[PDB]
């Protein structure tokens, strides 16, 4: 699970989607080209998407995403440096720890708040 | 030491997964129309006959208050941070 970490931290810490194999949770269609509509492939999931929390939280990392490319397409720049935010985000080093328990939920809560900071930064101000 | 990881599990956790009856706390979904969805509840019950000779029925009890508090915190007070 070393790349699939990979993949879901750069998700959720730059937008970025680099999926050459179709196996992340969510991808844009579209291959001008900015009403973007994404999907989420309901098979690869990591959480079942049943109960009420998992689709908090699956919604809440594909929000996250969202918002990070939407602020990464606006600078026209190709990645967020990490200082543009006091709340910085590690990589997932453990998928194991990460899928044991709430881990998952706080590593996307943190993901989201710098999101949210970054883009209402982003729109209040530029 | 299997014995340990269930309690250990319950005690950091929560958690009552795959104990198969061995374990003095066991998770009681089993309601009859009062608190469905476990508002008042929280479906956990403690067997006092279960509690194994070499645990004090005090230490159990606490053991039981102690998961029973981590998944109150964790579940309804949405203290996930710091239950974490």
């Given at each position: 699970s070393?790349?699939?970490?990979t993949?879901?931290?750069?998700?959720?810490?730059?937008?970025?989607?680099?999926?050459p194999?179709?196996?992340?949770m969510?991808?844009?269609?579209?291959?001008?080209?900015w009403?973007?509509?994404?999907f989420?492939?309901?098979?690869?999931?990591?959480?079942?998407?049943?109960?009420?929390?998992?689709?908090?939280?699956?919604?809440?990392?594909?929000?996250?995403?969202?918002?990070?490319?939407?602020?990464?397409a606006?600078?026209?720049?190709?990645?967020?440096?990490?200082?543009?935010?006091?709340?910085?985000?590690q990589?997932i080093?453990?998928?194991?720890?990460?899928?044991?328990?709430?881990?998952?939920?706080?590593?996307?809560?943190?993901?989201?708040?710098?999101?949210?900071?970054?883009?209402?930064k982003?729109?209040?101000?530029g | 030491?299997?014995?340990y990881?269930?309690?250990?599990?319950?005690?950091?956790?929560?958690?009552?997964?795959a104990?198969?009856?061995?374990?003095?706390?066991?998770?009681?979904?089993d309601?009859?129309?009062?608190?469905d969805?476990?508002?008042?509840?929280?479906?956990?019950?403690?067997?006092?006959?279960?509690?194994?000779?070499?645990?004090?029925?005090?230490?159990?009890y606490?053991?039981?208050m102690?998961?029973?508090?981590?998944?109150?915190?964790?579940?309804?007070?949405?203290?996930?941070?710091?239950?974490?």
């Amino acid at each position: 699970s070393q790349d699939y970490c990979t993949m879901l931290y750069e998700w959720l810490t730059q937008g970025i989607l680099n999926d050459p194999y179709q196996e992340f949770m969510t991808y844009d269609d579209l291959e001008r080209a900015w009403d973007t509509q994404y999907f989420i492939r309901k098979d690869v999931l990591l959480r079942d998407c049943d109960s009420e929390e998992d689709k908090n939280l699956l919604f809440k990392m594909l929000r996250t995403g969202i918002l990070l490319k939407v602020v990464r397409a606006s600078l026209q720049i190709p990645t967020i440096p990490s200082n543009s935010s006091d709340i910085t985000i590690q990589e997932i080093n453990d998928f194991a720890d990460l899928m044991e328990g709430s881990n998952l939920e706080l590593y996307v809560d943190k993901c989201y708040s710098r999101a949210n900071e970054i883009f209402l930064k982003l729109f209040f101000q530029g | 030491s299997l014995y340990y990881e269930y309690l250990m599990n319950w005690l950091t956790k929560g958690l009552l997964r795959a104990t198969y009856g061995e374990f003095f706390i066991a998770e009681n979904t089993d309601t009859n129309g009062t608190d469905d969805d476990f508002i008042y509840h929280i479906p956990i019950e403690f067997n006092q006959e279960r509690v194994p000779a070499f645990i004090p029925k005090e230490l159990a009890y606490k053991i039981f208050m102690i998961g029973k508090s981590y998944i109150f915190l964790e579940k309804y007070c949405k203290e996930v941070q710091w239950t974490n």
